[PDB]
Design a protein that fits this description.
The structure is a homodimer of 175-residue chains. In chain A, strands 1-5-2-12-11-10 form a six-stranded mixed beta sheet, covered by helices on one side. In chain A, strands 4-3-6-7-8-9 form a six-stranded antiparallel beta sheet, covered by helices on one side. Chain A is 11% helix and 47% strand. Chain A has a single domain (1-175), classed as Cytolysin/lectin (Mutm (Fpg) Protein, Chain: A, domain 2), CATH 2.60.270.20. The first copy, chain A, is mainly beta. The first copy, chain A, is built from two helices and twelve strands, in the order E-H-E-E-E-E-E-E-E-H-E-E-E-E. At the A-B interface, strand 1 and helix 1 of A face strand 1 and helix 1 of B.
């Protein structure tokens, strides 16, 4: 069970300790999503293209709170990373989705992330991963902040670093 | 399983986030113990005089790492405080014991804590709690740091606040 902390407490430092707490795995990610949307989010599901998470998505994330989640590559001598999608059903029946991609091979790939509000209840799956990763303009994990109007009177402001031990911090707020 | 982070990452803010993650309970405590003793610690056990914890002590806390732990009122409708002792067996065969006491009723009680190294492997129990509280001069949760040489070439510096939403952070280092 991932933690649900005060929105204002989410920071790079909290995410870096989550990363430290995961241990010396080659590819891992600490994810923080601050809910300032004015609507309560209810965990829907996650989908991992590569890797796993030892924890589950926090069930409820009220406005003013942030969820902490993490993921990592499958354990053992396997050249893979941590890539997946987490989805939350918003109070209005729409789905907030977050993509994270921490590849094993940095010679040909880079870190990417994305966030999007889908209409209606949309579970995370292979299609959503492909949609978010290839066709819906993901942001690079480039050690820089990125802001995007999500429609529905909200916007996201997020940051993801460039390394294999990644942190992804996103704030969803009212436009 | 409580988190094991880099010792230099342990801070009041990290502990404050651990507290928030426990949700709205009247009595709860976030404990952080940074091992800079020069010796590896192996979890021994915990003893709760009041309250409980929904996690266990991280098994191994090597030099340079800090353990994160927590406690709270009893599982159930019965409102209590969070009072107990956690014990770690150091590399030399001696036991690092830590007392934390967050009472239910502040009219007659206050926050207290204590740190002490026992000779040999000594499991936390009712007796160790009695000793650390009634016999061995515990420190008050008075928003102040307190230093005490522990013997074995080590000292402890700790801080605890005074509220029912308690934070106790201790650094064990070379004297």
């Amino acid at each position: 069970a991932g933690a649900v902390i005060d929105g204002a407490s989410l920071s790079f430092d909290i995410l870096k300790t989550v990363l430290e707490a995961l241990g010396n795995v080659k590819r891992k990610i600490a994810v923080g999503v601050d809910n300032e949307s004015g609507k309560t989010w209810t965990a829907l599901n996650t989908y991992f293209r590569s890797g796993t998470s030892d924890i589950v998505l926090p069930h409820k994330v009220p406005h003013g709170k942030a969820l902490l989640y993490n993921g990592q590559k499958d354990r053992g001598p396997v050249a893979t990373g941590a890539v997946g999608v987490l989805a939350y059903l918003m109070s209005d029946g729409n789905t907030l989705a977050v993509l994270f991609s921490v590849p094993y091979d940095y010679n040909w790939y880079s870190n990417w992330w994305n966030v999007r509000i889908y209409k209606g209840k949309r579970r995370a799956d292979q299609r959503m991963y492909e949609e978010l990763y290839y066709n819906l303009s993901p942001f690079r994990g480039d050690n820089g902040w990125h802001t995007r109007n999500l429609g529905y009177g909200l916007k996201s402001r997020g940051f993801m670093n460039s390394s294999g031990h990644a942190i992804l911090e996103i704030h969803v707020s009212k436009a």
